[PDB]
Design a protein around this ligand. Sequence first.
Ligand SMILES: Cc1cc2nc3c(=O)[nH]c(=O)nc-3n(C[C@H](O)[C@H](O)[C@H](O)COP(=O)(O)OP(=O)(O)OC[C@H]3O[C@@H](n4cnc5c(N)ncnc54)[C@H](O)[C@@H]3O)c2cc1C
Length: 565
Amino acid sequence: DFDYVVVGAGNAGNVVAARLTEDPDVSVLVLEAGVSDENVLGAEAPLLAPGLVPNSIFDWNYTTTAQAGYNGRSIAYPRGRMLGGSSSVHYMVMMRGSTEDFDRYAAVTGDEGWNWDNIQQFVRKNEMVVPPADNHNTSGEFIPAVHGTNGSVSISLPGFPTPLDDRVLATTQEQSEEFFFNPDMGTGHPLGISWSIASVGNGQRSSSSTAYLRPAQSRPNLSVLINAQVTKLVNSGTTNGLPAFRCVEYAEQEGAPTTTVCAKKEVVLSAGSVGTPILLQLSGIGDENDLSSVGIDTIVNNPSVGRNLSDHLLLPAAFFVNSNQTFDNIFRDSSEFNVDLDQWTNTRTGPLTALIANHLAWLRLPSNSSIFQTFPDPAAGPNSAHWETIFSNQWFHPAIPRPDTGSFMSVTNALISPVARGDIKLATSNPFDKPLINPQYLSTEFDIFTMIQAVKSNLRFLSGQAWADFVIRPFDPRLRDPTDDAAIESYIRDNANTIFHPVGTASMSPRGASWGVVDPDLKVKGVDGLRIVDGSILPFAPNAHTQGPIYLVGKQGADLIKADQ
Ligand SMILES: Cc1cc2nc3c(=O)[nH]c(=O)nc-3n(C[C@H](O)[C@H](O)[C@H](O)COP(=O)(O)OP(=O)(O)OC[C@H]3O[C@@H](n4cnc5c(N)ncnc54)[C@H](O)[C@@H]3O)c2cc1C
């Protein structure tokens, strides 16, 4: 049998599998619930990413419970269900977080190994900078010294330019008190307006399966099974005075017979922020009251399982623009799409290599904001963000289809420092039934107050000279008057959604602490022979879209595992 098993084949799970098998005497089995990523056009051409999920064979098809903060709406909660995990369906944007995120992870676990300086070594293992598809001069768009040159994931500057780029840059000069330029987020200082960097190499997706699992596939000590959903972690004995969890049961689908396999050393859960708590609950590790309400016997009582869920909420907003160079028609006119598909297929250049956004703004509330009279600042620290703004050359909205007429740019906000916390729980003890995902969006005065300010900021930005001949009007007339707080708040609660960055449902904490699910070396508290390496362990939302930090976790976690061999 195998030394390790390998719970999901995702953003962090593929790092662990590929790193452990560098040593030819260590065998790993990866169990992935989903299908192959191989020759899925929508997962290779960057521009086609938004279409892949939610309603599809590549998605788990999760939704949230009804949100009172969103006037009663449930929203889709997409997750990738295939080789590469969510790294095969994401928008490829790459950044690591602020220095304050990592120093706070160190301070709260007691382990200086997490921690901005000590983590930089993994950015170098993790990434290499390669040319943008259009091969433009990237001089002054990032700082080469703070990025990798030899690591596994290919990253680059935007591969196709847009009419927004020069206007964003001119706003950073016209409006520099509020919107100054940031040369590179890799400094650990996220604030300001920076050029996007994305996990794209040679005009296509660089994902965790392309970058780690595929090169490693010729190894005889690595084994990868797809269509293999783990349905139970099995309490396999008692070792080191604790219940041991080194066996798993897996099946192809509901109703099929289950296969049992064991690890000699450890089972590694890399099922992500939704997949990991629910699997623990299904195996009897979680809140005793919740488990017995659904007919499950508790083996380890730990109420932190599935709690402390943080996410970045999303606010979308489209504006009509005077332009024929937006990406909207690629999605409406088949001739145009096919001309750009041909160029992409033959040369890996043109519109299909384009990103969701070429520029990103990371922003704070004023130091004397009235909200601070009743909330302590929820930012990771004074050099970190309250919100983000993302500028796209088309219509972008997760819940409203692109209109048939009009050219658009969109201004999407993400709330980076929420006060809200939610949970993930079981509705039933059937591993094939969907979970109850309740992020509790806009359930605090800080969260709604900040999104109102975010909209006023968006409107000062679009009112600059650079936009005068370009922006015509908002798609939604509630975005016309920046002084009308009632109209703005109505807009936010009818439109806010998610930007897909859940963390925290299996939080790491100090050894012995009375909250958290894992120790700082990522071992499950109250159990022997089980380790968690994915997004679920991060105890706070970072200053980053979450592939960047999650790859660092995948990287320290592989080392943490080797250190106990
Ligand atoms: C539409 C969307 C857009 C996004 N946009 C971006 C972006 O631009 N940039 C960015 O940085 N982040 C983005 N994200 C964030 C990022 O993709 C995730 O935060 C991160 O990749 C997840 O890392 P992971 O290793 O925790 O989980 P995953 O990559 O989700 O992997 C978990 C794996 O576990 C498998 N699994 C789950 N349960 C089981 C089981 N019981 N048995 C077997 N297999 C199982 C899943 O099928 C999956 O393959 C996006 C995500 C989505 C859904």
